[PDB]
Every structure is written in C-alpha cells, then in structure tokens.
C-alpha cells in the first residue's frame, strides 16, 4: 500500500506514536517519507546482507526475522514480512521498541539526516488528525 501523507499521519496517530518519546507526529511522517516514500511494501538490502523493510525500513539486523540475516536478532519477536502489511501495527509496535532503545529516532538514518531539525510539522499540515 502507498499510503497519502495525511492517511498516514492519521494511522500513526491512532497507533499511539504521536509524542511517542517525544516525538510529535510530523517527525515519524518525515522518516516514513524518506525511508519509504509511504510504500508499505519498500525493501532495501544492506551491504553487510540485512534488509530493511516497509514504511519505516525496520532492519532485520536486529528487529525481525527475515531467515537470510546471518547472526541477526528478531527483538521484535516477528517475521520481517509482517512489516509490509498494509496494516501499520507491526511496523508501529516495532518502531516504539525502537525508539525505547535509546537513540530515539537516530535509529532512522534518514531522519536523522533529512527529517532531525526541520520544520517537521510541515509534514502534518492539512491533515484531519
Ligand atoms: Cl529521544
Ligand atoms: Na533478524
């Protein structure tokens, strides 16, 4: 699914990550954009043979299980291919282990380099939320 921008605001609000630590709304729908473009079926590889996927390119290095990450963690207990559901749930409920881990939303190297000191509210803007 490729989610609009104000669609997908919309779900991530209604699944609790608005001010999730912090983070206000307009910061998860920057990431999302630039991870993703909004495509909840997005896969990238990553040269050490990870992969990342969906709305938010979880990485299977550490987060799910994708049965091709050689001495890889699944911390959040679900095979990868849940995170490209047109159902955000997964890819929400991981994304809050995540940002709990304690680098916040620099887990997202597009966030941090596109998204972290921007006017993210931007992103939200027009948007019934
Ligand atoms: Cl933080
Ligand atoms: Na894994």
């Given at each position: ?15 609790g ?6 983070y206000?709304?307009?910061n ?18 990553n ?22 990450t ?20 997964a890819?929400?409920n ?36």
């Amino acid at each position: 699914k490729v989610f609009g921008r104000c669609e997908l605001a919309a779900a991530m609000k209604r699944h609790g990550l608005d001010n999730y630590r912090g983070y206000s709304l307009g910061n998860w729908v920057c990431a999302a954009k630039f991870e993703s473009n909004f495509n909840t079926q997005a896969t990238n590889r990553n040269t050490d043979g990870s992969t990342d996927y969906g709305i938010l390119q979880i990485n299977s290095r550490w987060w799910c299980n994708d049965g091709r990450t050689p001495g890889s963690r699944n911390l959040c207990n679900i095979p990868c291919s849940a995170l490209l559901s047109s159902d955000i749930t997964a890819s929400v409920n991981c994304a809050k282990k995540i940002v709990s881990d304690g680098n916040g939303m620099n887990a997202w190297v597009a966030w941090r380099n596109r998204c972290k000191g921007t006017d993210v509210q931007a992103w939200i803007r027009g948007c019934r939320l």
